[PDB]
């Protein structure tokens, strides 16, 4: 998978990839070291992020983002943007005059890392709050759980 598709050169800023190498240690390529971080709160780092090659500065595991504040869950409704998806959060709002609830929802645009592959319309995503990534995106997908009847 070629990772150079923009006008600029895509690269993890922390990793230095031009270290001098003698010809005796030139067994193909050096297998460019991968930068990854362990986000806390008991979330495992996907093996894809560790062993991947994608460049994503908004990735919670390989990019420059900090998970802080609220951790929420939603259902994936649309995946038509690049590296970001639209999830749906449903809830019941109480009305005190009638002592009864009404069904409400709100969509949320959340950044989805390339480390989560095979995400389908319908699965559950645990997202975590971060700094503003775009005009409307303030959350990053931290965990993906499949639907109840997946193959």
């Amino acid at each position: 998978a070629d990772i150079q598709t923009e006008r600029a050169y895509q690269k993890q800023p922390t990793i230095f990839q031009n270290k001098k190498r003698v010809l005796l240690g030139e067994t193909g390529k050096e297998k460019l070291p991968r930068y990854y971080k362990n986000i806390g709160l008991g979330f495992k780092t996907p093996k894809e992020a560790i062993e991947g090659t994608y460049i994503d500065k908004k990735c919670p595991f390989t990019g420059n983002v900090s998970i802080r504040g609220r951790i929420l869950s939603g259902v994936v409704t649309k995946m038509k943007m690049q590296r970001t998806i639209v999830i749906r959060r449903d809830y019941l709002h109480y009305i005190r005059k009638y002592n009864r609830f009404e069904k409400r929802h709100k969509n949320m645009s959340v950044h989805l890392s390339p480390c989560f592959r095979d995400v389908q319309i319908g699965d559950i995503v645990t997202v975590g709050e971060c700094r503003p990534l775009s005009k409307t995106v303030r959350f990053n997908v931290l965990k993906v759980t499949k639907a109840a009847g997946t193959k």
């Binding site: 806390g40 709160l41 008991g42 504040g69 951790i71």
Partner: protein, 262 residues
């Protein structure tokens, strides 16, 4: 509102000052200082409302401008100086020393201390950071930074500071079984032994504390102040020994005192 605010409405002042409603529109508005505005006792309130040494604000100013009041061993001529928890107020002309200790009902009590005990104080540690060629630094709840602290001293611990020099003399580690006072919230002013601390990563930690009478109560970690090692406090406690009476037993005690009076 452009720029900082300089006034404080009397009804908007913190309730533990015990300010009335009809004396004026405004309140003393504590100056910026080592203690937060909501958690301090301005010098004027203590010197006029509490001790009744002065009748008006001008008399408080006249008292302070003769350099009679010392807060933690230093002369303070600012009448709105924020004096807060564990501060030592010394008046040598009349020869008394007070320590600002929360009462059981969450108010700064007039607590007189001996001059031997007025030479030190206890400070909670807020953070530890290394700077400037690998020199460690401690920051206390009193906004004083101390370089070269003991490597064992960690956050949420308590250090005994010699007021004359400003150096650490000993410390208490934050651990279960150590005596503590609650410095904020519903249980403010209560004294008890730490029983258990539950950690919630990314959120606030809750500390459970058991009184000397067997009562238990929870607080947030930021509301806990280690007072003594084990059951013995390192300072003198106010007349109420940190235990909270319910309104029923308070009424019974008041009635017994009334009956025994005369």
């Amino acid at each position: 509102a452009r720029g900082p605010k300089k006034h404080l409405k009397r009804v908007a002042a913190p309730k533990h000052w015990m300010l009335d409603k009809l004396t004026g529109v405004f309140a003393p508005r504590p100056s910026t200082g080592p203690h937060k505005l909501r958690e301090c006792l301005p010098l004027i309130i203590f010197l006029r409302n509490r001790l009744k040494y002065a009748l008006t604000g001008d008399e408080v100013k006249k008292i302070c401008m003769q350099r009679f009041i010392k807060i933690d061993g230093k002369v303070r001529t600012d009448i709105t100086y924020p004096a807060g928890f564990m501060d030592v107020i010394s008046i040598d002309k009349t020869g008394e020393n007070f320590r600002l200790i929360y009462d059981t009902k969450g108010r700064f009590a007039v607590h007189r201390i001996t001059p031997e005990e007025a030479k030190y104080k206890l400070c909670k540690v807020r953070k530890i950071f290394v700077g400037t060629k690998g020199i460690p630094h401690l920051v206390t709840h009193d906004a004083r930074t101390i370089r070269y602290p003991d490597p064992l001293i960690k956050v949420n611990d308590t250090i005994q500071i010699d007021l004359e020099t400003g150096k650490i003399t000993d410390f208490i580690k934050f651990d279960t079984g150590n005596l503590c006072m609650v410095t904020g919230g519903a249980n403010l002013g209560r004294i008890g032994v730490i029983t258990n601390r539950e950690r919630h990563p990314g959120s606030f930690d809750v500390v459970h504390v058991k009184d000397a009478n067997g009562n238990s109560f929870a607080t947030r970690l930021s509301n806990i102040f280690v007072i003594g090692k084990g059951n013995k406090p390192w300072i003198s406690l106010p007349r109420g020994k940190g235990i909270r009476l319910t309104i029923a037993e308070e009424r019974d005690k008041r009635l017994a005192a009334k009956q025994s009076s005369g």
